[PDB]
Amino acid sequence: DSFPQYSPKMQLVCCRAIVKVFLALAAKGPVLRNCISTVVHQGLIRICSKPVVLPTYKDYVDLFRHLLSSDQMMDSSESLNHLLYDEFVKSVLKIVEKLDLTLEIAANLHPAKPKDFSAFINLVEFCREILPEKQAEFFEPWVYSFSYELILQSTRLPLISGFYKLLSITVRNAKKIKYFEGVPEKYSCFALFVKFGKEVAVKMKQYKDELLASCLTFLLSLPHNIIELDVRAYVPALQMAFKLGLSYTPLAEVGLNALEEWSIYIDRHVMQPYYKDILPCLDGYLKTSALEVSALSRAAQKGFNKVVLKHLKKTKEAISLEEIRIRVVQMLGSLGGQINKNLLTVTSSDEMMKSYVAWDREKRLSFAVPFREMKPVIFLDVFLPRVTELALTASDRQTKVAACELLHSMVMFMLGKATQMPEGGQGAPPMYQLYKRTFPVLLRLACDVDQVTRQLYEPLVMQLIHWFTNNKKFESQDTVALLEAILDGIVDPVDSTLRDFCGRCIREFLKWSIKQITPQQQEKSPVNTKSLFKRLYSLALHPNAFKRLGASLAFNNIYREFREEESLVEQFVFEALVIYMESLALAHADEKSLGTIQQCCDAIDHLCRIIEKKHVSLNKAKKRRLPRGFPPSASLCLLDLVKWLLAHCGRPQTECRHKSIELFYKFVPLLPGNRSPNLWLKDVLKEEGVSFLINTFEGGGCGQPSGILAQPTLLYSLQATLCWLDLLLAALECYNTFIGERTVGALQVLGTEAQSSLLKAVAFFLESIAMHDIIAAEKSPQEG
Amino acid sequence: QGLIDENPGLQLIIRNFWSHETRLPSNTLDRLLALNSLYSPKIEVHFLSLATNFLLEMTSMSPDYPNPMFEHPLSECEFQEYTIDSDWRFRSTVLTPMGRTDLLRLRRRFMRDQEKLSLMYARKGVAEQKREKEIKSELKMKQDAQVVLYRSYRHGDLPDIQIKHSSLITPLQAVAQRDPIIAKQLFSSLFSGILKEMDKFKTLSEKNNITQKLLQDFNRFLNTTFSFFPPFVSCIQDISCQHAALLSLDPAAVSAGCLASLQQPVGIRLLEEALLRLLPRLPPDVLRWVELAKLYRSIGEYDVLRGIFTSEIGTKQITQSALLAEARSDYSEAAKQYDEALNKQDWVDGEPTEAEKDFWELASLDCYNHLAEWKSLEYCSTASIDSENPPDLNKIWSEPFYQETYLPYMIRSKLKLLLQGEADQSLLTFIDKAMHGELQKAILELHYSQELSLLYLLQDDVDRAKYYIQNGIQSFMQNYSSIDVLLHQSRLTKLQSVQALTEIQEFISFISKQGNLSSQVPLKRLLNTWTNRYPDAKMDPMNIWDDIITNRCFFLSKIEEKLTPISSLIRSCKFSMKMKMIDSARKQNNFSLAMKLLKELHKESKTRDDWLVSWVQSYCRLSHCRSRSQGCSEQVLTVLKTVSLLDENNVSSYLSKNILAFRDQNILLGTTYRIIANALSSEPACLAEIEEDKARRILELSGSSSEDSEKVIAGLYQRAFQHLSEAVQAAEEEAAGVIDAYMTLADFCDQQLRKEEENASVIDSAELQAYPALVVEKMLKALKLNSNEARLKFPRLLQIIERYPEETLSLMTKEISSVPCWQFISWISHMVALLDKDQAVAVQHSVEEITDNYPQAIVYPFIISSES
Amino acid sequence: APSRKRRQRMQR
DNA sequence: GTGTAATCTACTGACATCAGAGTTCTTAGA
Structure with missing residues (x-):
């Protein structure tokens, strides 16, 4: 502990002393090696507890650095350094385990035991500063464990950063020692990283600024040999990496390093299609060229005497911006021409051919730069297409902040010159054409990762949304455009964090939409109130995973909006439950990697709960909103929706079936009968019998397309076989309802009447596919 | 020169100097005419920003400056002000x-033990030693x-439209100062505005004077600049375009400046407007058209060139023919x-204008450049620089035409004449002598870094190499x-x-890194990397391809020299990489370069067999391609007289060593025969008798034993087809060319059938009976892969089916038996039409499948075709 | 064919 | 520690000076 309180020469002698006491202790053998373990472990506790976070830990770097590497100690060792380093890493494992890191009350939470939470961070930054630099031969035995135990902790508690950081040290340190290239427990480590990599890719989308930085820092670092297994799962990760990097250098260096790695190892034909979308977003780093009297200077002035040597000898960190520029050019070169041509927008066919037209036929934004002797006119619109590009993607931050402040001024001018209407409609509203292409700029430039820009534009985007539902010109195509922009902001594929701001934007839009307009028009005059929901709903059923993802993420952010006052209009959502619960799980039997969607189905769960929590008035008579999936219109009562659920209680898509079953369970007691679930199922079996059950659990959902039919599946194949395999899975899990709450009796579960589900489970899978599963046929990594 | 000085303080002081009232005039127009004088070559890269700053900061004292830009806010919302934190921190981090108080501080004692005090300052000093260490670490981030910021940022629940005029003209200047393209737009707009509002103030007498003053000043600008910063060159021209009477800018000056600045198009429009406007009385105006020709040649659009010279406007038809040749990249004929x-001694109808000679020379130099001579x-x-035979290279820096037109090629020439093999020491002398004078030095250091780098590296002075190449990287970034x-x-x-x-x-x-010097693994690393990184094939001009080839060649020579106490591996790379260059040149229709590289790399054929077969393959490929272009009678010489002979497998058992060659070489021989037969059939009336002896003597040997007149062509085709068949049976051994070889046999059949339908050849049709069978059973076989080019020609199928009916059965039973139905959806329409007539047995199964799979496609065409 | 040139005087 | 003194110790030009070495002459002398 005393270490930092010394002088440099004192530091080196103190290191020597502590090193040798360690030697001496170790010499006496096992009786005290345990005690040496104790001593280091205690040490690390007391350093990681340094009372504040950024005598800070940064001071102690040298101590453990020399301790861990000074092979010169014994000659002026190899077993010494090995043992000591091993002890350090064991200490880190132990201390990461023993800490609690409990999270509960993304920023709406508060970490449980504060002082504990700070120590974690300290330890993270330490172990960063100490571990990889050794290039340890010694880390090889510890890759596996220091991973597995760390992954466990990560998964069990994501949304804590430094786990990813330590894991990044793990992976890089492994990479440097040619570990994974072999594809023992090494195959296990490659496997575990494969799975965590995919998992963390899925998770990365949702996360926000700092955690996003951590996760990318990790992901972008996995070795090549793991990449080519699942490429294009990471390409978006790297893109978002560079987008951050233009305003946080070390992450950018992490990128450029990563991209060099990929380009040099991954088989070219594998990656050729992908440089298209990845090399752009290099433009910013080269976007601009950004157009002393220290003691040694004065010393050398008087003469080249001995004193100069003292200063220069004493004279003799994270990468800087200029260095990363020269790196970016060096890499941009290193890929080669046949590759690098892609840095320009596209091959010259159509897309850039769009870039030429002016953003507006006729030049609005007429400014009158107010000189004295005269009043010339300067058209601010010609500035704008380049100013905006600066604003989003400039590298030099002085340029970027200046550009941002210009664009704020300039958009304010747009609004102003709008209200000085020179043209009241009778065609395209003036400055609409300008709005269409300035709003996406304004949006995705908000929730950028420069704190200054963020504070400058997030409020303005809120103010713009506010203005564009003010009563005056609430109807105008300008608001139509802005809403269209927000929606295409939700659906944004790559800009992960843009999603969240766009969501908040939609929320604010709906909020002011209710709060501002007279509802007399609002029922049917606008293109907003029901229109917005309709637009979402239309988005839901879409094939694209990202598009639905956006649909969800929006509808997630209108919990409160819909529950507040829309009590008049529970009804769109009393059917939306169907809409979302269905679509937002369809087409998720595939498209899993990019689809963090299923977590947003939890939003379906919340909207669910909030609609049933008003049930006494939910089931009012003569309320007959047309639903989807029900031909005969009638006054919807929850009975109908429940029957729908039970019909949909079984369906092949996994997440839906799980959520839907449990949702049925949570609904049924709310119904007027107040009958217990088991009681009500008994009711409908006395009413309909086992055939109802068999049709609804061996089948069900969207009608009766095809349920669990044993024999033809036994007899009748390619990866389609997986289809029915999932069917049987869904089957037995649906039977798991039966003593899920003891709702159905055993002879009621088994009347042996007309179902062979359990028969086929115990027979077909459990014989032919259970263990004979090396190669299946009924008569590629795809399978594996 | 000080106006750009490094210290911000002196920057402000000198600028404030130059903006005081008595230095630059106080009204606008007198300012705008003045700033032209505020320029020097060295202030260039900033001159735009500086002009903008001066103009606007005179705007700064006008009465509307604090008066808010828009009179009323847009609501009643209350407006607050908030500051933005900005404490040297970003967001993901x-x-x-x-x-008579002050007099109190005299109550002090003093430590008496100088030892104790000394230790006190000692610890104090180590404290500042650490404090300086951390502050040096943090000041980088802080810089x-x-x-x-630059304005107030009042907050309100609505937008705060009511911003002071300052709140926009000051930020605009800030951006202009910091980035130069916004500088160009701002200066251009503001110059346009001032010179447009000048009308309401001065009579035409004054306007002529001020416009002439600007024209003089701008001509000075362009003619004197050395940096050739793209933004400023562009800005000056762009100004000149949008106002009349600035338009008579020295055409040669603009041409040279735009050529250098890599910003051609703006110059094209300048001279464009010049031409149309100043001549709505000298008819020709050659000095302008020709420099426009130079420009369009830069931008590589040889197509438009064909217009300029066929106008009977001054230029001589020799230039026309030169351009037609050089459009086809026949650079040798162009030269x-x-x-x-x-070198024409005496002309009919007047010697070429001063400028046509210039264009001729520049085209000559470039045309050579595209070549390896x-x-x-x-x-x-x-040659043109001086009088005496041993040229005084130093003269090049005398008068500007050389400086811009002759230099770059001079330096590039001498560089490679060095870096290839060996040569004298002219260039080292030249550049060293040059690098004394200031403007002298600036030209080389700012433009031609990439060349001085290699030059100096030849002398094994690695340090200057680093400096220059770093400068080159920075220069690339800036320019x-x-x-x-948009460009x-x-x-x-x-x-x-x-x-x-x-x-x-x-x-x-x-x-x-000598650690990477003494070993052997990282030489293999570098060789492997360079082996598979190349410039873009079909796009990048050969003037860069040679740059990479020769650079790499020299660098390998140097590395070999280091690792003298391998050469197999280096030779391997040299083979491969030069071969790739030939392949490239073949694509670009730059043939003569390909000739020269083949001839330079044959002597390496004698070595082990893979390179032998590769060389012969490439040469025959090139010969075929050369034939395709031109030659109708003599073209048979261009292939037959050699290519047939070379391709003989007597020299290669490599087919027994690998199969890829066993495909490539056979398809080569196929196409070899194919053009021979095609052209022989082309105008047979005058071939065998015109290639009267040796080729004809070879012909029958290539044909059949019988030396009959007409039947020789069929004798060719028969072995042609069997050979292409050999190609396909090669293919069936495991898309690289197999799709292509399949299509190739397809095409041979296709042309043959077309020719057959125009006459009656019983024996050729009897042996043809296979041809349609194969075209269907095999082309459609190929349709499985994407085969876009094949999938297009699918109507040719149905027609083949019809006209040649007996063998339809193959179609159904073979490939429509297996088509992926979408690969017919593209034009499902035609055959759903044909779905009535007797062959309908054809599309039966396909239309059924597509009906089932993607029903909504068939319906719309099918519903109508149902009516028929 | 050999490549030959001669000097030229720029009339300015 | 950092920085400014004060001041000893150096080197050189220059000048005396012992010694050391190159040189001619008498006696004792094959």
Whole structure:
């Protein structure tokens, strides 16, 4: 502990002393090696507890650095350094385990035991500063464990950063020692990283600024040999990496390093299609060229005497911006021409051919730069297409902040010159054409990762949304455009964090939409109130995973909006439950990697709960909103929706079936009968019998397309076989309802009447596919 | 010169000097005419920003400056003000969930023990030693991230429209200062505005005077600049276009400046407007048209050139023919034409204008450049400079035409004449003598870094190599960020050089780590990497391809020299990489270069067999391609007289060593025969008797034993087809060319059937009976893969089916038996039409499948076709 | 064919 | 520690000076 309180020469002698006491202790053998373990472990506790976070830990770097590497100690060792380093890493494992890191009350939470939470961070930054630099031969035995135990902790508690950081040290340190290239427990480590990599890719989308930085820092670092297994799962990760990097250098260096790695190892034909979308977003780093009297200077002035040597000898960190520029050019070169041509927008066919037209036929934004002797006119619109590009993607931050402040001024001018209407409609509203292409700029430039820009534009985007539902010109195509922009902001594929701001934007839009307009028009005059929901709903059923993802993420952010006052209009959502619960799980039997969607189905769960929590008035008579999936219109009562659920209680898509079953369970007691679930199922079996059950659990959902039919599946194949395999899975899990709450009796579960589900489970899978599963046929990594 | 000084303080002081009232005039127009005088060559890269700053800061004292830009707010909302924090921090950086008093000071004692005091300052000093260490570590980040806002940012629940005029003209200036393309737009707009509002103030007498003053000043600008910063050159021209009477800008000056600045198009429009406007009385105006020709040649659009010279406007038809040749990249013929042109003794109808000679010379130099005759390049580049035979290279820096037109080729020539093999020491002398004078030095250091780098590296002075190449990387960044975004072709011609720079960087960094010197693994590493990184094939001009080839050649020579106490591996790379260059040149229709490289690399054929077969393959490929272009009678010589002979497998059992060759060589021989037969059939009336002896003597041997007159062609085709068949049976051994070879046999059949339908050949049709069978059973076989080119021609199928009916059965039973139905959806329409007539047995199963799979496609065409 | 040139005087 | 003194110790030009070495002459002398 005393270490930092010394002088440099004192530091080196103190290191020597502590090193040798360690030697001496170790010499006496096992009786005290345990005690040496104790001593280091205690040490690390007391350093990681340094009372504040950024005598800070940064001071102690040298101590453990020399301790861990000074092979010169014994000659002026190899077993010494090995043992000591091993002890350090064991200490880190132990201390990461023993800490609690409990999270509960993304920023709406508060970490449980504060002082504990700070120590974690300290330890993270330490172990960063100490571990990889050794290039340890010694880390090889510890890759596996220091991973597995760390992954466990990560998964069990994501949304804590430094786990990813330590894991990044793990992976890089492994990479440097040619570990994974072999594809023992090494195959296990490659496997575990494969799975965590995919998992963390899925998770990365949702996360926000700092955690996003951590996760990318990790992901972008996995070795090549793991990449080519699942490429294009990471390409978006790297893109978002560079987008951050233009305003946080070390992450950018992490990128450029990563991209060099990929380009040099991954088989070219594998990656050729992908440089298209990845090399752009290099433009910013080269976007601009950004157009002393220290003691040694004065010393050398008087003469080249001995004193100069003292200063220069004493004279003799994270990468800087200029260095990363020269790196970016060096890499941009290193890929080669046949590759690098892609840095320009596209091959010259159509897309850039769009870039030429002016953003507006006729030049609005007429400014009158107010000189004295005269009043010339300067058209601010010609500035704008380049100013905006600066604003989003400039590298030099002085340029970027200046550009941002210009664009704020300039958009304010747009609004102003709008209200000085020179043209009241009778065609395209003036400055609409300008709005269409300035709003996406304004949006995705908000929730950028420069704190200054963020504070400058997030409020303005809120103010713009506010203005564009003010009563005056609430109807105008300008608001139509802005809403269209927000929606295409939700659906944004790559800009992960843009999603969240766009969501908040939609929320604010709906909020002011209710709060501002007279509802007399609002029922049917606008293109907003029901229109917005309709637009979402239309988005839901879409094939694209990202598009639905956006649909969800929006509808997630209108919990409160819909529950507040829309009590008049529970009804769109009393059917939306169907809409979302269905679509937002369809087409998720595939498209899993990019689809963090299923977590947003939890939003379906919340909207669910909030609609049933008003049930006494939910089931009012003569309320007959047309639903989807029900031909005969009638006054919807929850009975109908429940029957729908039970019909949909079984369906092949996994997440839906799980959520839907449990949702049925949570609904049924709310119904007027107040009958217990088991009681009500008994009711409908006395009413309909086992055939109802068999049709609804061996089948069900969207009608009766095809349920669990044993024999033809036994007899009748390619990866389609997986289809029915999932069917049987869904089957037995649906039977798991039966003593899920003891709702159905055993002879009621088994009347042996007309179902062979359990028969086929115990027979077909459990014989032919259970263990004979090396190669299946009924008569590629795809399978594996 | 001080107006750009490094210290910000002196920057402000000198600028405030130059903006005081009595130095530059106080009204606008007198300012705008003055700032032209505020320029020097060296102030260039900033001159735009500086002009903008001066103009606007005189705007700064006008009465509307604090008067808010828009009179009323847009609501009643209350407006607050908030400051933005900006404390040298970004957003992804903090981890998530964490006076008679003064007289009193005389009451002091003093430590008496100088030892104790000494220790006190000692510890104190180590404290500042650590404090300085950390402050030096943090000041880098602080220099990066220091941001100063510029306005108030009042907050309100609505937008705060009511911003003071300052709140926009000051930020605009800030951006203009910091980035130069916005500078160009701002200065251009503001200059346009001032010179447009000048009307309401001065009579035409004054306007002529001020316009002439600007024209003089701008001509000075362009003619005197050396940096050639793309933004400023562009700004000056762009100003000139949007106002009349500035338009008579020295055409030669603009032409040269735009050629250099890699920003051509703006210059094209300048001279364009010049032409149309100043001549709505000298009819020709050659000095302008010709320099426009130079421009369009730069931008590589040889197509438009064909217009300029066929107008009976001044230029002589020798130039026309030269251009037609050089459009087809027949650069050799172009050079011959030009050389004969410049040396015409006496002309009919007047000697070429001063400028036509200029264009001729520049085209000559460039036309050589596209070639590998670099000794000729140097001779051309040096001849015109001086009088005596041993050229006084120093003269080049005398008067500007040389400085811009002759230099770059001079230096590029001498560089490679050095870096290839060996040569004298002219260039070292030249550049060293040059690098004394100031403007002298600036030209070389700012433009031609990538070349001085290699020059110096030849002398084994690695340190200067590093300095120059670093300068080159910075220069690329600066002269690239400058190029305006829309000019794609310009930016492309930029990037084509980052490969050169990076390659030089890598070699320097490779001869810097002796740990990577003494071993052998990382030489293999570098060789493997360079082996599979190449410039773009079909796009990048060969003037860069040679740059990479020769650079790499020299660098390998140097590395070999280091690792003398292998050469197999280096030779291997040299083979492969030069071969790739030939293949490239073959694509670009740059044939003569391909001739020369084949001839330069044959002597390496004698070595082990894979390179032997590769060389012969490439040469025959090139011969075929050369034939395709031109030659109708003599073209048979261009292939038969050699290519047949060379391709004989007597020299190669490599087919027994691998199969890829066993495909490639056979398809080569196929196409060899194919053109022979095609042209022999072309105008048979005058071939065998015109290629009267040796080729004809070879012909029958190539044909059949019987020397019959007409039947010789069929004798060719018969073995042709059997050979292509050999190609396909090669293919069936495991898309690389198999799709292509399949299509190739397809095409041979197709042309043959077309020819057959125009006559009656019983025996050729009898042996043809296979041809349609194969075309269906095999082309459609190929349709399985994407085969876009094949999938297009599918109507040819149905027609083949019809006209040749007996063998339809193959179609159904073979491939429509297996088509992926979408690959017919493309034009499902035609055959759903044909779905009535007797062959309908054909599409039956296909239309059924597509009906089932993608029903909504068939319905709309099918519903109508149902009516028929 | 050999490549030949001669000097030229720029009339300005 | 950092920085400014004060001041000893150096080197050189220059000048005396012992010694050391190159040189001619008498006696004792094959």
